[PDB]
A paper describes a structure:
To elucidate the molecular details of trans interactions of sDscam, we determined the crystal structures of Ig1 from Mesobuthus martensii sDscam isoforms α1, α7, and β6v2. We also determined the crystal structures of sDscam Ig1 from another chelicerate species Limulus polyphemus (isoforms α7 and β3v7) to provide insights into the conservation of sDscam trans recognition within Chelicerata. These crystal structures of Ig fragments were determined at 1.3–3.1 Å resolutions. The crystal structures of sDscam Ig1 from both M. martensii and L. polyphemus revealed a common assembly of antiparallel homodimer for both α and β subfamilies of sDscam. A previous study has demonstrated that Drosophila Dscam1 Ig7 use its ABED face to form a homophilic dimer through a charge complementary mechanism to ensure an antiparallel binding mode. Similarly, sDscam Ig1 also employs the ABED face to form an antiparallel homodimer. However, among the seven Ig1 structures reported here, the complementary electrostatic potential surface pattern (negative in one end, neutral in the middle, and positive in the other end) has been only observed in the three β isoforms, but not in any one of the four α isoforms. Electrostatic and shape complementarity had been observed in all Ig1 dimer interfaces.
Recently, a shortened Dscam (sDscam) gene family with tandemly arrayed 5′ cassettes in Chelicerata species has been identified, which encodes ∼50–100 isoforms. Chelicerata sDscams could be classified into two subfamilies, sDscamα and sDscamβ, containing one and two variable Ig domains, respectively. Crystal structures and cell aggregation assays demonstrated that both α and β subfamilies of sDscam used Ig1 for the isoform-specific trans recognition in a hand-in-hand manner. Furthermore, the cis interactions were established by the three FNIII domains of sDscam, which assemble into a cross fold with a kink between FNIII2 and FNIII3.
Residue numbers in the entry:
A (entry chain A): -4 to 95
B (entry chain B): -2 to 95
The structure:
């Protein structure tokens, strides 16, 4: 029937604060509001995240999971999720710090 | 090897929850040996899934999803993370503006 077209709104996500070398960290990007369907994009410090042996992105219909194993200093930085549907887009950026 | 005790990555609920929002939180280890099992509690009692409350557990994380959150969903949610070597629990408060 009538299809509501609602701009998406990202649920704010943040990284843990005393993360030390070698640990695993996960964050989720998901809408709190918005019409289906959703697309997700992850950025790190100005470029799209590239999956690797220790970095993985797993995207579902209504959320996307960023996983980093064996964190090191190179994994520190600002990670952004860009969320879109057919009505609009939203973005959230979270800073990851990695300590010795 | 394979006997590293689990430790949950601290999780928290958003601070902007209004009635009707979808909310998701994940429980996952920052350390610990695979395989894991997960349990969710609400105010000390295991979560009962329903039409608008879903628990989806994967190999290395568990997802709590609440559609159309309301005042009745407010409470203290615990994730219990288990493996062969031990157990950890983390609890976070879900608050809803009304
Ligand atoms: Na956090
Ligand atoms: Na998280
Ligand atoms: Na992932
Ligand atoms: Na760094
Ligand atoms: Na940035
Ligand atoms: Na976009
Ligand atoms: Na109880
Ligand atoms: Na799910």
């Amino acid at each position: 029937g009538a299809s509501g077209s609602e701009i998406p709104k990202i649920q704010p996500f943040f990284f843990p604060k005393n993360l030390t070398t070698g640990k695993t960290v996960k964050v989720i990007c998901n809408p709190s509001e918005g019409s289906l369907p959703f697309t997700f994009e992850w950025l790190k410090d100005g470029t799209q995240v590239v999956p690797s042996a220790h970095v993985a992105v797993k995207t579902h219909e209504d959320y996307s999971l960023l996983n980093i194993d064996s964190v090191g200093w190179e994994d520190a930085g600002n990670y952004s999720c860009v969320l879109n549907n057919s009505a609009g887009s939203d973005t959230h950026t979270a800073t990851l710090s990695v300590f010795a």
